[PDB]
Design a protein around this ligand. Structure first.
Ligand code: HEM
Ligand code: HEM
Ligand code: HEM
Ligand code: HEM
Lengths: 140, 143, 140, 143
């Protein structure tokens, strides 16, 4: 459950992220693939090398999903219903992988926005990514 | 922890540029802020209500210096992590009752702090090497 | 997030539990203390022996809270607010302990209701206890 | 796993009354039902949509018999769990990529199944010794 203060923090942080979302998501996916090779088994049809166009496109898709989740923070379960059905019913992704991807997104945000990544902003982003991860792993 | 020569060279070079006295305490404070249930252990330190009070605590700064010094001692003995952190593991398991998941959380917070301080030169390969290093440290502490 | 089906399953299961809630909660607390001694550090003022009146009373309170949560499944954050502030702000309990207590409650329910503990009922109770644990581990 | 003589005697006596052919499959099916993401590894077992189809699966039953036989082999070598579960650890880590938390989940499901099948006989101390046994098995597998 999120408060108003951290919701405002995530909204401001992602608004300041802005148009770099696609490259940030691609870099986060690359970091997840490089540091957690077990997650590579979920993408056997992808080319998982550095600078891959498929990874860049999937990162752009993930970034757009994060942007619309930020826009719909108060009503996540039904705003991300298609993704929840994709990840839980079809893909059957372990929530550990969601935790790893959230950690890699946090690392990317820290490495790209030092002034933006305050300790309060870090906590707000952490629990926002936990809320997106729980919605996408929920099966209902 | 088994590392390639390139990974070990990258890890050691970044560690030399690390400001221990700052980043150890900042990592501890970020752990306390993002995971507030960890303040049960740090009640003696004093005011830990607001993030600005957590990050401005001399006791938190000193304890983060000690935690980073152990991380440096572990980095210098990457092939003997289990034997290096035996006394610390005993202290954390029997005297402090700290759950092992908190070690992984602190390692992730430390990695985030390193990314925040090193920006672009914290490449994904460096992050992977540091992730497996902190995972080995957490496993040695949980033993 | 819970579905209507598992919500109905937990409602029926706890309605059939009925008046044995206090004994079941006391036994669950005893099981948690015996199998996970690290949780005993959260009760330094209690007498944690077998058949203890303090443990029986605390189990009765926990069972009453669980019954209230069952009666208020759709609005847990607003129904368990006092307990959320107690466990998250004052007590500051690790969610691992909540997971252990949920597992011990599941073991107690399995040992006391064989016919009731169907595999679907088990899944519904697991998700219900995860939802109560998440509400009591969140900060507002 | 370190256990008292009373705990070891209690664990072995309950295990003798264990109907492996039923309980192993029951534990595997309950794992698949309560934690549906585990069906990714067993998609080759056929129909796993409904709980009634999961519990009526001969492949699930046979695999549960094999998992319980390994649990019995581990119980017979409680002082050598790491060496008993080395080939299985390699198979689950390098070939199957199963997350170690799933081992703990399966151990908890097995404990719940034992409680369901034994009732009052599965007393809190017996549950405690069994929890230590399944934690040791999970740690040996995760190595
Ligand atoms: C944590 C936040 C996540 C978000 C916001 C997210 C979002 C998305 C989006 C937008 C798609 C595109 C679906 C489509 O184009 O049809 C997708 C697909 C997919 N996701 Fe995620 N995802 C997340 C986590 C994960 C994780 C951690 C994994 C695996 C470790 C994963 C595995 C997949 C896979 C395998 C696909 C299929 C892509 C394809 O077939 O091209 N997801 N996800
Ligand atoms: C994960 C890597 C960790 C490292 C390298 C580490 C390192 C250390 C060291 C070297 C000490 C000795 C301090 C002294 O002798 O004065 C210590 C003490 C302590 N540790 Fe850790 N620690 C870690 C994780 C944790 C975590 C995650 C927590 C709590 C959530 C924790 C709780 C404590 C406490 C409460 C003390 C005693 C502080 C005091 O008495 O003032 N440790 N740690
Ligand atoms: C579903 C899970 C839980 C429920 C429904 C629950 C419910 C309750 C209730 C009703 C009380 C009584 C508060 C009062 O009388 O003022 C309480 C107190 C307390 N709870 Fe929990 N609780 C849960 C989990 C836990 C766990 C897992 C722990 C620790 C491992 C814990 C630690 C405590 C403590 C220390 C108290 C104080 C009791 C006292 O001071 O007498 N709670 N809880
Ligand atoms: C204490 C926990 C576990 C034990 C003792 C155990 C034991 C076993 C055994 C005895 C086998 C048979 C290997 C062979 O016949 O060569 C096996 C295979 C396998 N295990 Fe496990 N296992 C455990 C946990 C898990 C979990 C939790 C999963 C998945 C979520 C899993 C996934 C698999 C798969 C997919 C196979 C191969 C099945 C097949 O090829 O038909 N294991 N395991």
């Amino acid at each position: 459950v999120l408060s108003p203060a951290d919701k405002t923090n995530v909204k401001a942080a992602w608004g300041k992220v802005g148009a770099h979302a696609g490259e940030y998501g691609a870099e986060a996916l690359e970091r997840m693939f490089l540091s957690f090779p077990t997650t590579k088994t979920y993408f056997p049809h992808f080319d998982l090398s550095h600078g891959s166009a498929q990874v860049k496109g999937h990162g752009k898709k993930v970034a757009d999903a994060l942007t619309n989740a930020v826009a719909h923070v108060d009503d996540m379960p039904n705003a991300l219903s298609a993704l929840s059905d994709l990840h839980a019913h079809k893909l059957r992704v372990d929530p550990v992988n969601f935790k790893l991807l959230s950690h890699c997104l946090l690392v990317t945000l820290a490495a790209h926005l030092p002034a933006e990544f305050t300790p309060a902003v870090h906590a707000s982003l952490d629990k926002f990514l936990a809320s997106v991860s729980t919605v996408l792993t929920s099966k209902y | 922890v088994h590392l390639t020569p390139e990974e070990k060279s990258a890890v050691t070079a970044l560690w030399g540029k690390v400001n221990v006295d700052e980043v150890g305490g900042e990592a501890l404070g970020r752990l306390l802020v993002v995971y507030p249930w960890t303040q049960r252990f740090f009640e003696s330190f004093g005011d830990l209500s607001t993030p600005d009070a957590v990050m401005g605590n001399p006791k938190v700064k000193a304890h983060g210096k000690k935690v980073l010094g152990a991380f440096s001692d572990g980095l210098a003995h990457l092939d003997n992590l289990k034997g290096t952190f035996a006394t610390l593991s005993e202290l954390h398991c029997d005297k402090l009752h700290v759950d092992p998941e908190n070690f992984r959380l602190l390692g992730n917070v430390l990695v985030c702090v390193l990314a925040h301080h090193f920006g672009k030169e914290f490449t994904p390969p460096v992050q992977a090497a540091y992730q497996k290093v902190v995972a080995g440290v957490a496993n040695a502490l949980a033993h």
